[PDB]
Design a binder for this molecule. Sequence first.
Ligand SMILES: *[P@@](=O)(CCCCC/C=C/C/C=C/C/C=C/CCCCC)OC
Ligand SMILES: [Ba+2]
Ligand SMILES: [Ba+2]
Ligand SMILES: [Ba+2]
Length: 684
Amino acid sequence: QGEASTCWQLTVRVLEARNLRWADLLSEADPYVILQLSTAPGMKFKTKTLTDTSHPVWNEAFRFLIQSQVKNVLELSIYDEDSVTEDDICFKVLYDISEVLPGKLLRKTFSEEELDVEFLMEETSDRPENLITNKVIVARELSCLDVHLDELELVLKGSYEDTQTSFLGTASAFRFHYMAALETELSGRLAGYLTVPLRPLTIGKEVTMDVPAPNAPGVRLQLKAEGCPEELAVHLGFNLCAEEQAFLSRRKQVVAKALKQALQLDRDLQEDEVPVVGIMATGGGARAMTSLYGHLLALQKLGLLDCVTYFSGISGSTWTMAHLYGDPEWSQRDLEGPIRYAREHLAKSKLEVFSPERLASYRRELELRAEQGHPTTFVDLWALVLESMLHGQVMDQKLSGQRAALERGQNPLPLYLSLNVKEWVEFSPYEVGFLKYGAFVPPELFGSEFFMGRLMRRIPEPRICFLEAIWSNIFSLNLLEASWLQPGTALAQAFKGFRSPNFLQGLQLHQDYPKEPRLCLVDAAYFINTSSPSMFRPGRRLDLILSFDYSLSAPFEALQQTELYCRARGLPFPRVEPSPQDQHQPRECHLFSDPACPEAPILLHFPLVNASFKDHSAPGVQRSPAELQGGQVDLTGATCPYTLSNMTYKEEDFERLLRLSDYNVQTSQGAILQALRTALKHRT
Ligand SMILES: *[P@@](=O)(CCCCC/C=C/C/C=C/C/C=C/CCCCC)OC
Ligand SMILES: [Ba+2]
Ligand SMILES: [Ba+2]
Ligand SMILES: [Ba+2]
C-alpha cells in the first residue's frame, strides 16, 4: 500500500528569452514568465515583468519540491503584460523534469522564439514523504490545517478548498486539505493580510494569530496542522473487489446447475471447474437495444443464459441492460414482458419529448439540480430527454440498487463500459472505476466530490438515466436531416438564459509508469468498439466470450480493435482473420479459437446479418411462402429503419430485427454447446 520516498529540491532559473513576437500596432512585448508544475496545482511563480523587449533578461530563480516517484511536468510560458486587457500568451512549453539528474546542473534552450533555463536538483534533509500507491496511481501525502474562531477570509493556495469565509463571530471552525510537500502559506483578513507560512514535510505546531478588524475588536484564531484524519474512499488496486469475488461463488453454482442440464452431464461440477462465460456487446443506439433483447431471448429459450457469469455492453446495449436489471429476477422471468415495454416505447412518437411541457420539467429539474452541487452539462439534458424517449416518465432506479439482482447469483454481473475524455471507465453495481488506473469507488459515491482519494462531500447517487447519458453520450463537448434540425431550435430557444471534476481529483501518476464547429462527437472510438476491456480486467479469467455485434457495416471491426487492445497488453487472445468470403457475406456465428494460443478465451461472434433467416422462420424450419415478408429485414440501402439516428421504430420493424436476432443465436445452439464443452476442459 504505502511507500516512503524523499523529495528533491529543484531550482529552476529563468535566464532570457529571444525573438519574442510583438503585440499588434507596432507594440513590443512587455514580457514575463509563469512557472507551473502539474503536480503542484494552484501554485504559480511569475518573473518580474520587463517592458518593450524582444530579448528579455530576467535571470530569476525559483524552488520547488519534487517527488521523484511521481511524473512531474513543468509548464513554463511567456505572457505579454497589458495594463488594461488580459495578457496574451506568446510562448508555451511543457517539460518533463525526469531528464534532470541530482547534482548535474542542466542548461536548456526551449524553442523563432527561444527561452533559456537552468535546472538544479539537490538532495534535501526532510523526512521522506508518505505516499499511498498502486504503482500507476499515487496519492501524495496530505496534511490538514485546522482553524478555530475564538467577513473572515482565509486563503490557502494549493489546497482543495482554495479560500473559505464565515460571516459569524461565535465558535466557528474550518478545515483545509493540502499536500504535505507544498511550500505555502495561510492568509487571513477581515486593512491588512496576516500570513502564516506552512513549510513542507514538517510537524505542525499550535499557533495563535489575532487578526485585526478595521479598526474595532480583533479576532483570535487557533491554527494547527496535522495529517488528514480521513481514510481513502477510493480503492487502489488491480484485483477484483470482495463483493465481485463473493458474487462469483454465488453465480458459479447456478451456472453449474444450468450447465449440467444443458450439457446433460455425468456429475455435479465443483466451483473451480465452472467455466467463466461472458457476454460482450457493442453500441448502436436503438438497433443494439432491440437486437440484444432478441439475443437474450434466444439464450433464455435454450437454457443457456443461466450459464453466463458476466454481461457487458457499450452505449445502446446498456439501455437494454439498465431496464432489465431494474427487475431483480429478469433472467428468470419471461423476457417477452420487457420486450413489449421496449417495443411500445420505441413505437411511440417523439414529438412531445420536445414539447414545452416537458422542456419546462427538464429545465425545472436542471435548476433544482443546479441549486444542488452539480455542474450542468449537455449530458445532463441528454439524460432527461433519453429517459423520456425510453420511458414515459421519470424512472426512480439507481445503479447501486441492481445489487438486488445479484444477491442470490440469479443474474449475470452487468458491466457498463464507458469511454471518457481516452480512458475506459467500467460501471457495475459493486464498483465504478478506471480500468487503466485501477481506481474504483462504489456507485453511490460516483458523482460525489473527492480529493486525493478522499471523500470531501457526499452527493446523492443519481437516477440511472444520468449514467445512461454518460454511456450513450453522443454530443460534442462544445455545442456553442431536416427531422432533428428543428428540435434543436425548440431546445435552444427554451433554454436561453443559462467544469466537471471526477473522483481522481488530486491524484497523480507514478513515475516508472478554418471551420470545424461540431454538434456531435466524431472520434471513431466512440462508435466502433465493443466491451472487451471489461472482459479483460485483470482478475476476470474468461473462458468463453459470446460477442454480439450490432454494426451495419464492418461486422468484425470491434473484434480487430479488441485484438489490438489485447496485443498491446500481452493478453492471450485468438486472432481474427476472417476470409474474404466471411467479409462479404458473413454468417450467423463465427468461431475464433486459437489452440495455437493457449489460455486464450474461446470466442463466438455474432454479426448482425440476415443470411439464412431469409428462408427459415425458425431454427431448421423452412420458411413458408406466406411468411416470406417475415424474413425480409431491411438492413441495407436507403430508408433502412435501423440507422443510428433513428429513435422511433414501427412495431413491425422492431419485430423483424428482434426475431432475426433471436434466430441467429438459436440457430447456433450447437456451436455454443460445442464451445461450452470446450470451455470445460480448458478451465480444468
Ligand atoms: P451509442 O450507441 C448511442 C446512440 C444514440 C443515438 C441517439 C439519437 C438521438 C437523436 C435525438 C437527439 C436529441 C436532440 C438533442 C438536441 C440536439 C440539437 C441542439 C441544437 O453511441 C455510439
Ligand atoms: Ba509594449
Ligand atoms: Ba492583465
Ligand atoms: Ba478542530
